[PDB]
Design a protein around this nucleic acid. Sequence first.
DNA 1: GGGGAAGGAAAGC
DNA 2: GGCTTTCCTTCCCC
Length: 341
Amino acid sequence: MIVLFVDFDYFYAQVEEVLNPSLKGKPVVVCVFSGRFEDSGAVATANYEARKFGVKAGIPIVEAKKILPNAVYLPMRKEVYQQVSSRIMNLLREYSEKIEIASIDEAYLDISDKVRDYREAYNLGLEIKNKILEKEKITVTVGISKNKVFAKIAADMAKPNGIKVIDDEEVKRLIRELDIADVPGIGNITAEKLKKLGINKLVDTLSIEFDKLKGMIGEAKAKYLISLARDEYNEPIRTRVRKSIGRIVTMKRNSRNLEEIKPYLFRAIEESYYKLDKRIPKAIHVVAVTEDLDIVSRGRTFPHGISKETAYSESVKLLQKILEEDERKIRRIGVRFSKFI
DNA sequence: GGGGAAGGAAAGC
DNA sequence: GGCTTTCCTTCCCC
Ligand SMILES: [Ca+2]
Ligand SMILES: [Ca+2]
Ligand SMILES: [Ca+2]
C-alpha cells in the first residue's frame, strides 16, 4: 500500500484569507461565539501569525484577546468552509477512485495502483498541491507512507505547506523512537494510562503482557498499537458516509425548566433538519450538557423515518426522561439524528 | 459465550 | 464552542 494523505493548512483561517487577501500576513482568529456574554466562546482555529503566540483551537476567545488584542477576530462561517472543502475534495477524486474523506479538511487516497514507488508518489503529491493551489489558492500538507496512520504522521511532521514520505526504513525507526503520545488515537487520557505502564514508544507494547495492556486501555486500542508496533497495521481506504447529523446550542442561562428549555431544543431541531437535507433519520437523540459540563443523552429508534413533527414531539419526551432521571441543571441542549434510510 | 442495543468515554476536527 | 466517529460497559436474549 502507498497511501497519500492530504490535510489543508490552517483551514478555516486560510479560507477567510482567500476570500479577503488583505488578511494575509496578519494574525487571524476564527471564533465560535456562544452568545452568553461579550466574547464568550472558543477559538475554532487561527492562522500562523496568531498561533505562533499561543492562540490555538479550543482556548477561550477571552484568553486569545488577552494575548493578541489587535488580531482580526472573525466569526466561524462553517457553510463557506464546507463548500470550499467539497470542491477541493472533488479535485482529489481525480487522482484515485479509492478515497476516504476523513473530515472537513482531510482525505486519504490509496495510490497503490497509480504510482510504482515513493519517488512517483512524492511527485504526485506535488502535482496535487499545485492543482489545489492553482484552482482554489489553498495550501495543504501531504503525507505519504505505507498505511493511513503513518501517512498522517508524515503530514504532521511536514506541516504547514509541506510534503513528506516516511519510507519503510523510517517506519521502523519511528516504531522505536516516536513518542507513543504522538500516535493518532492516543489522547491525554490514554497517554496517561500508558505512562502508568512504562510504555512511551510503540515498540514497548510488544513486550508488555497483552492482558495488562488491554485492561488499561481496552482491547481495541491495545490491538491497534500492537499491530502498528509489529508493522502489520492494515486498514483499507474506504468511502465514508455521514452517519449522524445534529446541533447543540448553549442556553442564555442554566435551567431544568421544560418550558424554558423547549425553545432551544426546538431551534436545535429546526437547524438539524436544515442540515439533513433529504436524508431521513430513523433515530433521534436528545443531548444535554449539564451545568458541571457532563454530557447526558436519551434516544429513540423508529421502524420508519422521523418527520419533523415526530422529532418535535419525541424530543420533548426524551428531554423529560433526562430531567426525570438526572438532577443537574442543563447548560446546553440539542439533538442528534442518525440511522438514515 | 457472545451478538445487539443503549448510553457513556475518548478522540480528532 | 461545537460536530462526528468509534470503542467501552451493561444488560437482554439466543
Ligand atoms: Ca489533521
Ligand atoms: Ca488542517
Ligand atoms: Ca496525542
